[PDB]
């Protein structure tokens, strides 16, 4: 079928990649359109596969620009310093989605989590199934990778998503677990894997010498 | 007449004068054009004098931009990263074509050749009017001028263009002459004098203690 | 026995070791000596293993100093800014002879040879039992190791000592052999292999279209 390959992921405080492949070239139209994370889809553009035909979009003109590779099937649209963008074709329609292509508009540096956790053993006053959890803090870029005991623990495992701090571009996420209360010989280790900065994080608490 | 001086040649891996002289100048519009290296024409542009009105082709408006100088009456087209250039006038005709300024798409650098010639005395088997030549390989930037015994041997003399070389963007030219087997006390010297590089080579071969 | 280990050969534009061995030490007297190439033996100094009695050479106390080690039975002698050096005991006698240590007062930089052989085929005027040899010219440091086609050809070999240039501090060699003049078809490679410059050259010479 019509199928694509988009690439790839970067962070920039700039070309994407768009490559046509399994049909004939030349028969529909790269068309490039974004969406601002949690939100709606914004239409950027068309080109034809015969001319580079701009109609760009009023408010993309200037940042987006897309340009042609007839030759070899792909399509290239470049920009200038925040989304996940996306080329489609048959220009009336939308049916030839491709892959999804995350930019961010970023000036942070590649770190690693500074995980501050609570694992108590389900004892931090009288519940039977109390709480646990890390706080996966300070990384870029995204994401992390969270497992329990190496994945051991699944049941009540809730992964939050990143929130993005406004202090220095560093997201935070946290991964929490309810374990009961009859569990207090079990450790629960959160193993954070932040990959782009290759980052291996495993966590626990414990008491203050309770009563 | 009508006379242009265009310049010049350059090496990127880009701003081209047209200076129009010998008539009044708001007469006539300058008009872009330019051939790839063994291909057709491709028109570029045609700017008013008066003004800057681009009107340019639909493939040529992202990479090349023309600009006007209507005080002095020099024109300039401007270029981002491999062929001749012409600027003409009288868009309707194209009667006043100017001087031919060759841009290269180039990555190499300026280099001498290395001949690797053979210049046997027509005495590799039997042959009466056998063959020699020398083989000038790796240089950058174009051309080499290449002379038989500082210019003497001019008959026979066939240079071959520089065939550009997918290795290292080094292009390849070898000059052949045709002497006669009753010649054998007769070196040739191509005299290769590649001058961007100004290196001077010159050459000859001999045998292999034969019989 | 007593044996000695000296260390090591050096270019200075400076310890020298002296490893005693195989016997008991505090027992004979560390004398350093030294010899300048092609010259006679200039005595240095004598220290006891016990203390740093000094008692160098009137000529030699500034430039070299003579240090003890004497719990790991080493000793050293320090030189600041030409020949060959020695480590002797038995300060009466001179029986214990040390290895042998050459430094060089360099400034040169270490580099390959650049042989500008004869190697004809005995064929050069008329002579029967004629000549050839390699000009192994411009290396740095010492020395070259040169083999006539990988060391076949050993009769007639007569290879020169490094005579030292006044140009460059760069010593220059010839090794010479004397084949016959019925061995024309027969090529005679030196192969000059400078090790401490890591290069290994390989030459033979034609001759020039005779009759």
Redesign the interface.
């Given at each position: 079928e019509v199928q694509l390959v988009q690439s790839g992921a970067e962070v920039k405080k700039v070309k994407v990649s768009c490559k046509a492949s399994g049909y004939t070239f030349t028969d529909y139209y790269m068309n490039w359109v974004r969406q601002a994370p949690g939100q709606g889809l914004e239409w950027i553009g068309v080109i034809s596969p015969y001319?580079?035909?701009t109609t760009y979009n009023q408010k993309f003109k200037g940042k987006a620009?897309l340009?042609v590779d007839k030759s070899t099937s792909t399509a290239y649209m470049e920009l200038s310093s925040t989304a996940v963008y996306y080329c489609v074709y048959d220009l009336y329609y939308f049916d030839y989605w491709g892959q999804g292509t995350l930019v961010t508009v970023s000036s942070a540096s590649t770190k690693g989590p500074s995980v501050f956790p609570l694992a108590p053993c389900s004892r931090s006053t009288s519940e039977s199934t109390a709480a646990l959890g890390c706080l996966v803090k300070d990384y870029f870029p995204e994401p992390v990778t969270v497992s329990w005991n190496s994945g051991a623990l699944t049941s009540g495992v809730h992964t939050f998503p990143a929130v993005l701090q406004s202090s220095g571009l560093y997201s935070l996420s946290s991964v929490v677990t309810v374990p009961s209360s009859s569990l207090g010989t079990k450790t629960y280790t959160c193993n954070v894997d932040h990959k782009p900065s290759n980052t291996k994080v495993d966590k626990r608490v414990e008491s203050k010498y309770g009563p």
């Open positions: 001319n580079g035909g620009t340009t």
